[PDB]
Amino acid sequence: SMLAELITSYRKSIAIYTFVDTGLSVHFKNGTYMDINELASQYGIDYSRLNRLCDFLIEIGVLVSSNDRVALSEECRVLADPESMESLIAKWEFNSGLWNAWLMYPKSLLENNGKSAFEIANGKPFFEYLDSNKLLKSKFDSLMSKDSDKMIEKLFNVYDFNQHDKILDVGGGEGNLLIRMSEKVKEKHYAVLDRYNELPDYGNINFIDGDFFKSIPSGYDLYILKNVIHDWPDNDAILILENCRKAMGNNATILLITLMKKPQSNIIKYFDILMDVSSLGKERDLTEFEYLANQAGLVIQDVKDIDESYSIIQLGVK
Amino acid sequence: SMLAELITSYRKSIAIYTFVDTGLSVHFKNGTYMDINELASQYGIDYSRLNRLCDFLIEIGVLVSSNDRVALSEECRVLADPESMESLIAKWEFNSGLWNAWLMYPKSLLENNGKSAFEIANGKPFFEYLDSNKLLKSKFDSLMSKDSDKMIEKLFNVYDFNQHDKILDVGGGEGNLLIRMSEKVKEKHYAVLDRYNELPDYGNINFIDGDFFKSIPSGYDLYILKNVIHDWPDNDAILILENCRKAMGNNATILLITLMKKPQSNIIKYFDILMDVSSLGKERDLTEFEYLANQAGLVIQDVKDIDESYSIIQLGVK
Ligand SMILES: Nc1ncnc2c1ncn2[C@@H]1O[C@H](CSCC[C@H](N)C(=O)O)[C@@H](O)[C@H]1O
Ligand SMILES: Nc1ncnc2c1ncn2[C@@H]1O[C@H](CSCC[C@H](N)C(=O)O)[C@@H](O)[C@H]1O
Ligand SMILES: [Cl-]
Ligand code: NA
């Protein structure tokens, strides 16, 4: 039945996770056809068990078959590229911490104690958990950087970054937004604020180890908040925006790069439940963003679509 | 996108898990509409968080909406019934033991050291884990009992159980197959063999605490193996059938009630990966069953369809 299919859908996700995690995926570049017997021998996997996994991946349209040889389907070819968005999701999404968070979604709803399903499952908030696991953080950080890679060209078209001299990426992680930005937009003071166990290095980017709940570095004319605000409950989001307001000058800009609840967005509902489970975060409409801005002592000056899901919100001091 | 959607489709599974586990589903009997605010108040869930879950359940076709009011979709009305197949799956499938088994699927393939993904994840094999968790075992056993409820009518008019005097259900669990069988096939000697922390009690049914790897009781003219063989690798399946051979008389019958890889067996690959991860089990075609029987000194006398996925295989002594 349709309902039976929905309940067992998670097995499709796990089949893809397994294909990548085993190291098999990177042998299927450019829709090339592989002998399963050969792969099984190389990796010391039982042929029959590997063939049964491939049969399932054929059934769900990830693999195609021809003369006892298997290739990635046209739509799933990106899975052979380890730097593809889909590969980076497959290498992050199924980490034991986030996987177990989902089981505590019901408990997190019934308790209503300000603890996310993730914190109930793992005994630590999401970003504390990442702070304690270097390899898992690099997998998350890599996925976030790929999001900046996919958006930078769309971003240039909707906002003139060249009008700014000093730019701070607030919660910028690896700082890939500014790395990509620095390729077209030259002779700027580029800086990134995040939580770092070790400060990263890249060109003349000023990486600052800090905490946007405590303070925001002053003296920047542009403050960028990309995929930050949706992580946080209202009060936490207001504190970040308020710390930004107190740090910034009267002629300075805050630019939110954010998913926004718009009429057509299936994808925002998937992010909404992920944000809830991960950190009691949420996706917001323009009215909810207006509320955050007003509470923080800011005003929205401009709103523009980056694409169907993503938008820029330009704020100044009220 | 189609690949991205397959990777995140587990969230659909968790959404239904959550809807049942919170106890929300039983509130929606007879396709009646509910106010989401009243629902939230009844269960002490934050209204906004419950609304966001409901928006996801509408998107995936579990709920239908009329403004602030939601009802179960025609296809998902069974979630209101706590005794439905889909409800019993939702209450079993997402136990932390089996959920975490899926993460160890890649390691189980690469290790190839006779240990299931379940045993790697949980530190003990599937049926040992159920031995030590009574509440979880009752949820597993209930789901198995429902499978018997579903096929007993089709099973009656495919095999004449009335021709036998003494019947043993080997790995029969709660013994629901014989319970339901006894309703229309009366004045028989019914017996169930399984591993029990406490003996079930029903009518004249002889519940026997045993281990089908060690011995099968003698003196029954019918031995039923329903949904047992597919749990086991070839060597364990042969041993079970060997123990049935050594127990049974020359005039006695073994009846395998089993999922079979046959033409128009739609959902066999889903069960196949489940059996692999759970206990290094597998689904088999008639040839593979032929091999198991021959190795255990048995002969396939008859094969018949129960439905599109389930078959009966009639065995006698070679
Ligand atoms: N207290 C805090 N102070 C600063 N940065 C924080 C923080 N808590 C979380 N973050 C950072 O907020 C980021 C959210 S993910 C978004 C990353 C990046 N802006 C991008 O769009 O690709 C992470 O890099 C995380 O480390
Ligand atoms: N060593 C063993 N000896 C006896 N029964 C065993 C066993 N290992 C597993 N089982 C039982 O095998 C069954 C597999 S599930 C199938 C149950 C039932 N025949 C039905 O079709 O609904 C479980 O009840 C489990 O407890
Ligand atoms: Cl939330
Ligand atoms: Na960045």
Side-chain angles (χ1 to χ4, degrees), chain A residues 1-3 6-7 9-11 13 16-18 21 44-45 49 52 55 75 89 93-94 99-100 102-103 105-106 108 110 112 266 269-270 272 276 280, chain B residues 2 6-7 9-11 13 16-18 21 46 49 52 59-60 75-76 86 93-94 99-100 102-103 105-106 108-109 269-270 272 276 280-282:
Chain A
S1 61
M2 169 226 62
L3 179 53
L6 288 179
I7 290 165
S9 287
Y10 73 91
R11 296 189 200 165
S13 308
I16 297 166
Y17 152 76
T18 302
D21 191 61
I45 304 169
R49 287 186 63 208
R52 288 163 54 197
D55 280 344
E75 298 145 63
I89 293 170
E93 189 98 350
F94 305 90
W99 193 245
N100 280 284
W102 297 103
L103 297 191
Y105 185 30
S108 76
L110 293 175
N112 205 337
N266 296 338
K269 292 164 186 149
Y270 281 80
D272 223 352
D276 185 294
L280 290 173
Chain B
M2 90 82 77
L6 283 177
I7 293 172
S9 71
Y10 72 86
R11 293 184 206 170
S13 311
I16 294 160
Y17 159 71
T18 297
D21 190 64
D46 174 81
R49 293 184 64 201
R52 299 201 305 269
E59 177 66 31
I60 71 171
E75 289 223 41
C76 292
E86 290 84 354
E93 189 100 358
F94 304 92
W99 192 243
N100 278 285
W102 293 102
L103 292 194
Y105 189 21
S108 72
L109 285 168
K269 289 187 196 77
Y270 283 80
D272 195 49
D276 185 300
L280 291 171
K282 55 183 286 198

Coordinates of all heavy atoms in Angstrom, one line a residue, chain A residues 1-3 6-7 9-11 13 16-18 21 44-45 49 52 55 75 89 93-94 99-100 102-103 105-106 108 110 112 266 269-270 272 276 280, chain B residues 2 6-7 9-11 13 16-18 21 46 49 52 59-60 75-76 86 93-94 99-100 102-103 105-106 108-109 269-270 272 276 280-282:
Chain A
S1 N 0.9 -1.2 0.0 CA 0.0 0.0 0.0 C 0.9 1.3 0.0 O 2.1 1.1 0.3 CB -0.9 0.0 1.2 OG -0.2 0.0 2.4
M2 N 0.3 2.4 -0.3 CA 1.0 3.7 -0.3 C 1.6 3.9 1.1 O 2.7 4.4 1.2 CB 0.0 4.9 -0.5 CG 0.6 6.3 -0.2 SD -0.4 7.4 0.7 CE -0.6 6.4 2.2
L3 N 0.8 3.6 2.2 CA 1.3 3.9 3.6 C 2.4 2.9 3.9 O 3.4 3.4 4.6 CB 0.1 3.7 4.5 CG 0.4 3.8 6.0 CD1 1.1 5.2 6.3 CD2 -0.9 3.7 6.9
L6 N 5.5 4.3 2.4 CA 6.0 5.5 3.2 C 6.8 5.0 4.4 O 7.9 5.6 4.6 CB 4.9 6.4 3.6 CG 4.2 7.2 2.5 CD1 3.1 8.1 3.0 CD2 5.2 8.1 1.7
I7 N 6.3 4.1 5.1 CA 6.9 3.5 6.4 C 8.3 2.9 6.1 O 9.1 3.1 7.0 CB 5.9 2.6 7.1 CG1 4.7 3.3 7.6 CG2 6.6 1.8 8.1 CD1 3.5 2.4 8.0
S9 N 10.2 3.6 3.4 CA 11.0 4.5 2.5 C 12.4 4.7 3.0 O 13.3 4.9 2.1 CB 10.2 5.9 2.4 OG 9.1 5.8 1.6
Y10 N 12.6 4.7 4.3 CA 13.9 5.0 4.9 C 15.0 4.0 4.4 O 16.2 4.3 4.4 CB 13.8 4.9 6.5 CG 13.7 3.5 7.0 CD1 14.8 2.7 7.3 CD2 12.4 2.9 7.1 CE1 14.6 1.4 7.8 CE2 12.3 1.6 7.6 CZ 13.4 0.9 7.9 OH 13.2 -0.4 8.4
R11 N 14.5 2.8 4.0 CA 15.4 1.7 3.5 C 16.1 2.2 2.1 O 17.2 1.8 1.9 CB 14.7 0.4 3.3 CG 14.2 -0.2 4.6 CD 13.6 -1.6 4.4 NE 12.7 -1.9 5.4 CZ 11.9 -3.0 5.4 NH1 11.8 -3.7 4.3 NH2 11.1 -3.2 6.4
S13 N 16.9 5.3 1.4 CA 17.9 6.3 1.9 C 19.1 5.5 2.4 O 20.3 5.9 2.0 CB 17.3 7.1 3.1 OG 16.1 7.7 2.7
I16 N 21.3 3.9 -0.4 CA 22.2 4.9 -1.1 C 23.4 5.2 -0.2 O 24.5 5.3 -0.7 CB 21.4 6.2 -1.4 CG1 20.3 5.9 -2.4 CG2 22.3 7.3 -1.9 CD1 19.2 7.0 -2.6
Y17 N 23.1 5.4 1.1 CA 24.1 5.7 2.2 C 25.2 4.5 2.2 O 26.4 4.8 2.2 CB 23.5 5.7 3.6 CG 24.3 5.3 4.7 CD1 25.3 6.2 5.3 CD2 24.1 4.1 5.4 CE1 26.1 5.8 6.3 CE2 24.8 3.7 6.5 CZ 25.8 4.6 7.0 OH 26.6 4.2 8.1
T18 N 24.7 3.3 2.0 CA 25.6 2.1 2.0 C 26.5 2.0 0.8 O 27.7 1.8 0.9 CB 24.7 0.8 2.1 OG1 23.9 0.9 3.3 CG2 25.5 -0.5 2.1
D21 N 29.1 4.7 1.5 CA 29.9 4.4 2.7 C 30.9 3.3 2.4 O 32.0 3.3 3.0 CB 29.1 4.2 3.9 CG 29.9 4.2 5.2 OD1 30.5 5.2 5.5 OD2 30.0 3.1 5.9
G44 N 36.4 -7.2 -0.6 CA 36.2 -8.3 0.3 C 34.8 -8.4 0.8 O 34.6 -8.7 2.0
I45 N 33.8 -8.1 -0.1 CA 32.4 -8.2 0.2 C 31.9 -9.5 -0.4 O 32.4 -9.8 -1.5 CB 31.6 -7.0 -0.4 CG1 32.1 -5.6 0.2 CG2 30.1 -7.1 -0.1 CD1 31.6 -4.4 -0.5
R49 N 25.6 -11.0 -1.4 CA 25.0 -10.0 -0.6 C 25.1 -8.6 -1.3 O 24.2 -7.8 -1.2 CB 25.8 -9.9 0.8 CG 25.4 -11.1 1.7 CD 26.1 -10.9 3.1 NE 25.6 -9.7 3.7 CZ 26.3 -9.0 4.6 NH1 27.5 -9.3 4.9 NH2 25.8 -7.9 5.1
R52 N 22.5 -8.4 -4.2 CA 21.2 -8.2 -3.6 C 21.0 -6.7 -3.3 O 19.9 -6.2 -3.5 CB 21.0 -9.1 -2.3 CG 20.8 -10.6 -2.7 CD 21.1 -11.5 -1.4 NE 20.2 -11.1 -0.3 CZ 20.4 -11.4 0.9 NH1 21.4 -12.2 1.3 NH2 19.5 -11.0 1.9
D55 N 20.5 -5.1 -6.7 CA 19.2 -5.4 -7.2 C 18.2 -4.5 -6.6 O 17.3 -4.0 -7.3 CB 18.8 -6.9 -6.8 CG 19.3 -7.9 -7.8 OD1 19.8 -7.5 -8.9 OD2 19.3 -9.1 -7.4
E75 N 20.0 10.0 -13.6 CA 19.6 11.0 -12.6 C 20.5 10.9 -11.3 O 20.5 11.8 -10.5 CB 18.1 10.8 -12.2 CG 17.1 11.0 -13.3 CD 15.9 10.1 -13.3 OE1 15.1 10.2 -12.3 OE2 15.7 9.3 -14.3
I89 N 25.9 15.0 1.2 CA 24.7 14.7 2.0 C 24.8 13.2 2.5 O 24.7 13.0 3.7 CB 23.3 15.0 1.3 CG1 23.1 16.4 1.0 CG2 22.2 14.4 2.1 CD1 22.0 16.7 0.1
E93 N 24.5 12.9 6.4 CA 23.1 12.8 6.9 C 22.9 11.7 7.9 O 22.1 11.8 8.8 CB 22.2 12.6 5.7 CG 20.7 12.8 6.0 CD 20.1 14.1 5.7 OE1 20.9 15.1 5.4 OE2 18.9 14.2 5.7
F94 N 23.7 10.6 7.7 CA 23.4 9.3 8.4 C 24.4 9.1 9.6 O 24.4 8.0 10.1 CB 23.4 8.2 7.4 CG 22.4 8.4 6.2 CD1 22.8 9.1 5.1 CD2 21.1 8.0 6.3 CE1 22.0 9.3 4.1 CE2 20.2 8.3 5.3 CZ 20.6 8.9 4.2
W99 N 21.0 10.5 13.1 CA 20.1 9.3 12.8 C 19.3 9.0 14.1 O 18.1 8.8 13.9 CB 21.0 8.1 12.4 CG 20.2 7.0 11.8 CD1 20.0 5.8 12.3 CD2 19.4 7.0 10.6 NE1 19.2 5.0 11.5 CE2 18.8 5.7 10.4 CE3 19.2 8.0 9.6 CZ2 18.0 5.4 9.4 CZ3 18.3 7.7 8.5 CH2 17.8 6.4 8.4
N100 N 19.9 9.0 15.2 CA 19.2 8.7 16.5 C 18.4 9.8 17.0 O 17.4 9.5 17.7 CB 20.3 8.2 17.6 CG 20.7 6.8 17.3 OD1 19.9 5.8 17.6 ND2 21.8 6.6 16.7
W102 N 16.1 11.5 15.4 CA 14.8 11.2 14.7 C 13.9 10.4 15.7 O 12.7 10.7 15.7 CB 14.9 10.6 13.4 CG 15.6 11.5 12.4 CD1 16.9 11.4 12.0 CD2 15.1 12.7 11.8 NE1 17.2 12.5 11.1 CE2 16.1 13.3 11.0 CE3 13.9 13.4 11.8 CZ2 16.0 14.4 10.2 CZ3 13.7 14.5 11.0 CH2 14.7 15.0 10.3
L103 N 14.5 9.4 16.3 CA 13.7 8.5 17.2 C 13.2 9.3 18.4 O 12.2 8.8 19.0 CB 14.6 7.3 17.7 CG 15.2 6.4 16.7 CD1 15.8 5.2 17.3 CD2 14.1 6.0 15.7
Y105 N 12.1 12.4 18.3 CA 11.2 13.5 17.8 C 9.9 13.5 18.6 O 9.4 14.5 19.1 CB 11.0 13.4 16.3 CG 10.2 14.4 15.6 CD1 10.1 15.7 16.1 CD2 9.5 14.2 14.4 CE1 9.4 16.7 15.4 CE2 8.7 15.1 13.8 CZ 8.7 16.4 14.3 OH 8.0 17.3 13.6
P106 N 9.2 12.3 18.8 CA 8.0 12.2 19.6 C 8.2 12.7 21.0 O 7.3 13.5 21.5 CB 7.6 10.7 19.6 CG 8.4 10.1 18.5 CD 9.6 11.0 18.2
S108 N 10.5 14.7 22.2 CA 10.8 16.2 22.1 C 9.5 17.0 22.0 O 9.5 18.1 22.6 CB 11.8 16.5 21.0 OG 11.2 16.5 19.8
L110 N 6.4 16.0 23.1 CA 5.6 15.7 24.3 C 6.2 16.4 25.6 O 5.5 16.8 26.5 CB 5.5 14.2 24.6 CG 4.6 13.5 23.5 CD1 4.7 12.0 23.8 CD2 3.2 14.0 23.5
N112 N 8.4 19.3 25.8 CA 8.2 20.8 25.6 C 9.0 21.5 26.6 O 8.5 22.5 27.3 CB 6.7 21.1 25.7 CG 6.3 22.4 25.0 OD1 7.1 23.3 24.8 ND2 5.0 22.5 24.7
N266 N 7.8 22.7 -1.5 CA 7.8 21.4 -0.8 C 9.0 21.2 0.0 O 8.9 20.6 1.1 CB 7.7 20.2 -1.9 CG 6.5 20.2 -2.8 OD1 5.5 20.8 -2.4 ND2 6.6 19.6 -3.9
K269 N 9.4 22.3 3.9 CA 8.7 21.4 4.9 C 9.7 20.4 5.3 O 9.7 20.0 6.6 CB 7.5 20.8 4.3 CG 6.3 21.7 4.0 CD 5.3 21.2 3.1 CE 4.2 22.2 2.7 NZ 3.7 21.9 1.3
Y270 N 10.6 19.9 4.5 CA 11.7 18.9 4.8 C 12.7 19.5 5.6 O 13.2 18.8 6.6 CB 12.3 18.3 3.5 CG 11.5 17.2 2.8 CD1 10.4 17.6 2.1 CD2 11.7 15.9 3.0 CE1 9.6 16.6 1.5 CE2 10.9 14.9 2.5 CZ 9.8 15.3 1.7 OH 9.1 14.3 1.1
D272 N 12.1 22.2 7.6 CA 11.4 22.6 8.8 C 11.5 21.5 9.9 O 11.9 21.8 11.0 CB 9.9 22.9 8.5 CG 9.4 24.1 9.2 OD1 10.1 24.7 10.0 OD2 8.2 24.5 8.8
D276 N 13.7 21.5 13.4 CA 13.0 21.1 14.7 C 13.8 20.1 15.5 O 14.2 20.3 16.6 CB 11.6 20.6 14.4 CG 10.7 20.4 15.7 OD1 11.1 19.5 16.5 OD2 9.8 21.1 15.9
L280 N 15.5 22.7 17.6 CA 14.3 23.4 17.7 C 14.3 24.7 16.9 O 13.7 25.7 17.3 CB 14.0 23.7 19.2 CG 13.7 22.5 20.1 CD1 13.7 23.0 21.6 CD2 12.4 21.9 19.7
Chain B
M2 N 15.7 14.0 -7.7 CA 15.1 12.7 -7.5 C 16.0 11.9 -6.6 O 15.5 11.2 -5.8 CB 14.8 11.9 -8.9 CG 16.0 11.0 -9.4 SD 16.0 9.4 -8.6 CE 14.7 8.6 -9.5
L6 N 15.2 10.7 -2.6 CA 15.4 9.3 -2.2 C 16.2 9.4 -0.8 O 15.9 8.6 0.1 CB 16.1 8.5 -3.2 CG 15.3 8.0 -4.4 CD1 16.1 7.2 -5.4 CD2 14.1 7.1 -3.9
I7 N 17.3 10.2 -0.8 CA 18.2 10.3 0.4 C 17.5 10.8 1.6 O 17.8 10.3 2.7 CB 19.4 11.2 0.0 CG1 20.3 10.5 -1.1 CG2 20.3 11.5 1.3 CD1 21.4 11.4 -1.6
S9 N 14.1 10.6 2.1 CA 12.7 9.9 2.2 C 12.5 9.2 3.5 O 11.3 9.0 3.9 CB 12.5 9.0 1.0 OG 13.3 7.8 1.1
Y10 N 13.6 8.9 4.3 CA 13.5 8.3 5.6 C 12.7 9.3 6.6 O 12.1 8.8 7.5 CB 14.9 8.1 6.2 CG 15.6 9.3 6.6 CD1 15.5 9.9 7.8 CD2 16.5 10.0 5.7 CE1 16.2 11.1 8.2 CE2 17.2 11.1 6.0 CZ 17.0 11.7 7.3 OH 17.7 12.8 7.6
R11 N 12.7 10.6 6.3 CA 12.0 11.6 7.1 C 10.5 11.4 7.0 O 9.8 11.7 8.0 CB 12.4 13.0 6.7 CG 13.8 13.4 7.0 CD 14.1 14.8 6.6 NE 15.5 15.0 6.3 CZ 16.0 16.1 5.8 NH1 15.2 17.1 5.5 NH2 17.3 16.2 5.5
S13 N 9.1 8.3 6.7 CA 9.0 7.1 7.7 C 8.9 7.6 9.1 O 8.0 7.2 9.8 CB 10.2 6.2 7.5 OG 10.3 5.9 6.1
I16 N 5.6 9.4 10.2 CA 4.5 8.4 10.5 C 4.8 7.8 11.8 O 3.9 7.7 12.6 CB 4.4 7.4 9.3 CG1 3.9 8.1 8.0 CG2 3.5 6.3 9.7 CD1 4.1 7.4 6.8
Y17 N 6.0 7.3 12.1 CA 6.5 6.8 13.4 C 6.1 7.8 14.5 O 5.4 7.3 15.5 CB 8.1 6.7 13.4 CG 8.7 6.7 14.7 CD1 8.6 5.6 15.6 CD2 9.5 7.8 15.1 CE1 9.2 5.6 16.8 CE2 10.2 7.8 16.3 CZ 10.0 6.7 17.2 OH 10.7 6.7 18.4
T18 N 6.3 9.1 14.3 CA 6.1 10.2 15.3 C 4.6 10.3 15.5 O 4.2 10.4 16.7 CB 6.7 11.5 14.9 OG1 8.1 11.2 14.8 CG2 6.4 12.6 15.8
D21 N 3.6 7.2 17.6 CA 4.3 7.1 18.9 C 3.8 8.1 19.9 O 3.7 7.8 21.1 CB 5.8 7.2 18.7 CG 6.5 6.8 20.0 OD1 6.4 5.6 20.4 OD2 7.2 7.6 20.6
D46 N 3.5 21.9 21.9 CA 3.5 23.3 21.4 C 2.8 23.3 20.0 O 3.1 22.5 19.2 CB 5.0 23.8 21.2 CG 5.0 25.1 20.5 OD1 4.8 26.1 21.3 OD2 5.2 25.2 19.3
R49 N 4.8 23.7 16.6 CA 5.6 22.5 16.3 C 4.6 21.4 15.8 O 5.0 20.8 14.7 CB 6.4 22.0 17.5 CG 7.5 23.0 18.0 CD 8.3 22.4 19.1 NE 9.0 21.2 18.7 CZ 9.4 20.2 19.6 NH1 9.2 20.4 20.9 NH2 10.0 19.2 19.1
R52 N 3.5 22.3 12.2 CA 4.6 22.1 11.3 C 4.7 20.6 11.0 O 4.9 20.2 9.8 CB 6.0 22.6 11.8 CG 5.9 24.1 12.0 CD 7.3 24.8 12.0 NE 8.2 24.2 13.0 CZ 8.3 24.7 14.3 NH1 7.6 25.7 14.8 NH2 9.2 24.1 15.1
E59 N 1.6 17.1 3.3 CA 2.5 17.0 2.1 C 2.7 15.6 1.6 O 2.7 15.4 0.4 CB 3.9 17.7 2.4 CG 4.9 17.7 1.3 CD 4.5 18.5 0.0 OE1 3.8 19.5 0.2 OE2 4.9 18.1 -1.1
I60 N 2.9 14.6 2.5 CA 3.3 13.2 2.2 C 2.0 12.4 2.1 O 2.1 11.2 1.8 CB 4.3 12.6 3.2 CG1 3.7 12.4 4.6 CG2 5.5 13.5 3.2 CD1 4.6 11.6 5.5
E75 N -6.4 6.7 2.4 CA -5.3 5.6 2.2 C -4.6 5.4 3.6 O -4.0 4.3 3.7 CB -4.3 6.0 1.2 CG -4.8 6.0 -0.2 CD -3.9 5.3 -1.3 OE1 -3.3 4.3 -0.9 OE2 -3.8 5.9 -2.4
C76 N -4.8 6.3 4.6 CA -4.0 6.2 5.9 C -5.0 6.1 7.1 O -4.5 6.2 8.2 CB -3.1 7.4 6.0 SG -1.7 7.4 4.9
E86 N -0.3 -1.7 9.6 CA 0.5 -0.5 9.4 C 0.8 0.1 10.8 O 2.0 0.5 11.0 CB -0.2 0.6 8.5 CG -0.3 0.1 7.0 CD -1.4 -0.8 6.7 OE1 -2.2 -1.2 7.6 OE2 -1.6 -1.1 5.5
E93 N 9.0 -1.1 13.9 CA 10.0 -0.9 12.9 C 11.1 0.0 13.4 O 12.3 -0.1 12.9 CB 9.4 -0.3 11.6 CG 10.3 -0.3 10.4 CD 10.1 -1.4 9.4 OE1 9.3 -2.3 9.6 OE2 10.8 -1.4 8.4
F94 N 10.8 1.0 14.2 CA 11.7 2.2 14.5 C 12.4 2.0 15.9 O 12.9 3.0 16.5 CB 11.0 3.5 14.3 CG 10.4 3.6 13.0 CD1 9.1 3.2 12.7 CD2 11.2 4.1 11.9 CE1 8.6 3.3 11.4 CE2 10.7 4.2 10.6 CZ 9.4 3.8 10.4
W99 N 16.8 0.2 14.1 CA 17.1 1.6 13.5 C 18.6 1.7 13.3 O 19.1 2.1 12.2 CB 16.5 2.7 14.3 CG 16.5 4.0 13.6 CD1 17.2 5.2 14.0 CD2 15.8 4.4 12.4 NE1 16.9 6.2 13.2 CE2 16.1 5.8 12.2 CE3 14.9 3.7 11.5 CZ2 15.6 6.5 11.1 CZ3 14.4 4.4 10.4 CH2 14.7 5.8 10.2
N100 N 19.4 1.4 14.3 CA 20.9 1.5 14.4 C 21.5 0.4 13.6 O 22.6 0.7 13.0 CB 21.4 1.6 15.8 CG 21.2 3.0 16.4 OD1 22.0 3.9 16.1 ND2 20.3 3.1 17.3
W102 N 20.8 -0.5 10.6 CA 20.8 0.0 9.2 C 22.2 0.8 9.0 O 22.7 0.7 7.9 CB 19.6 0.9 8.9 CG 18.4 0.0 8.9 CD1 17.4 -0.1 9.8 CD2 18.0 -0.9 7.8 NE1 16.4 -0.9 9.5 CE2 16.7 -1.4 8.2 CE3 18.5 -1.2 6.6 CZ2 16.0 -2.4 7.4 CZ3 17.8 -2.1 5.8 CH2 16.6 -2.7 6.2
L103 N 22.6 1.5 10.0 CA 23.9 2.3 9.9 C 25.1 1.3 9.8 O 26.1 1.8 9.2 CB 24.1 3.2 11.2 CG 23.1 4.3 11.3 CD1 23.6 5.3 12.4 CD2 22.9 5.1 10.0
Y105 N 25.1 -1.5 8.1 CA 25.0 -2.3 6.8 C 26.3 -2.3 6.0 O 26.8 -3.3 5.6 CB 23.7 -1.8 6.1 CG 23.3 -2.6 4.9 CD1 23.7 -4.0 4.7 CD2 22.5 -2.1 3.9 CE1 23.3 -4.7 3.6 CE2 22.1 -2.8 2.8 CZ 22.5 -4.1 2.6 OH 22.1 -4.8 1.6
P106 N 26.9 -1.1 5.8 CA 28.2 -1.0 5.1 C 29.3 -1.8 5.8 O 30.0 -2.5 5.1 CB 28.6 0.5 5.0 CG 27.4 1.3 5.6 CD 26.3 0.3 6.1
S108 N 29.0 -4.4 7.9 CA 28.6 -5.8 7.8 C 29.1 -6.4 6.4 O 29.6 -7.5 6.4 CB 27.2 -6.0 8.0 OG 26.4 -5.6 6.9
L109 N 28.9 -5.6 5.4 CA 29.3 -6.0 4.0 C 30.8 -6.1 3.9 O 31.3 -7.1 3.3 CB 28.8 -5.0 3.0 CG 27.3 -5.1 2.7 CD1 26.8 -3.8 1.9 CD2 27.0 -6.3 1.9
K269 N 12.3 -7.6 -2.5 CA 13.6 -7.0 -2.4 C 13.7 -6.2 -1.1 O 14.8 -6.1 -0.5 CB 13.9 -6.1 -3.6 CG 14.3 -6.9 -4.9 CD 14.8 -6.1 -6.0 CE 14.7 -6.8 -7.4 NZ 13.3 -6.8 -7.9
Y270 N 12.6 -5.6 -0.7 CA 12.5 -4.8 0.6 C 12.8 -5.8 1.8 O 13.6 -5.5 2.6 CB 11.2 -4.1 0.7 CG 11.1 -2.8 -0.1 CD1 10.8 -2.8 -1.5 CD2 11.4 -1.5 0.5 CE1 10.8 -1.7 -2.2 CE2 11.4 -0.4 -0.3 CZ 11.1 -0.5 -1.7 OH 11.1 0.7 -2.4
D272 N 14.3 -8.6 1.6 CA 15.6 -9.3 1.3 C 16.7 -8.5 2.0 O 17.5 -9.1 2.7 CB 15.9 -9.4 -0.2 CG 17.0 -10.4 -0.5 OD1 17.0 -11.5 0.1 OD2 17.9 -10.0 -1.3
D276 N 18.8 -9.5 5.5 CA 20.3 -9.3 5.5 C 20.7 -8.6 6.7 O 21.6 -9.1 7.5 CB 20.8 -8.6 4.2 CG 22.3 -8.6 4.1 OD1 22.9 -8.0 5.0 OD2 22.8 -9.1 3.1
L280 N 21.4 -11.7 8.6 CA 22.1 -12.3 7.4 C 21.2 -13.4 6.8 O 21.7 -14.4 6.2 CB 23.5 -12.9 7.8 CG 24.5 -11.9 8.2 CD1 25.8 -12.6 8.8 CD2 24.9 -11.0 7.1
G281 N 19.9 -13.1 6.9 CA 18.8 -14.0 6.2 C 18.7 -13.6 4.7 O 19.5 -12.7 4.3
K282 N 17.8 -14.2 4.0 CA 17.6 -13.9 2.5 C 16.3 -14.5 2.1 O 15.8 -15.5 2.7 CB 18.8 -14.5 1.7 CG 19.0 -16.0 1.9 CD 20.2 -16.5 1.1 CE 19.9 -16.6 -0.4 NZ 20.9 -17.6 -1.0

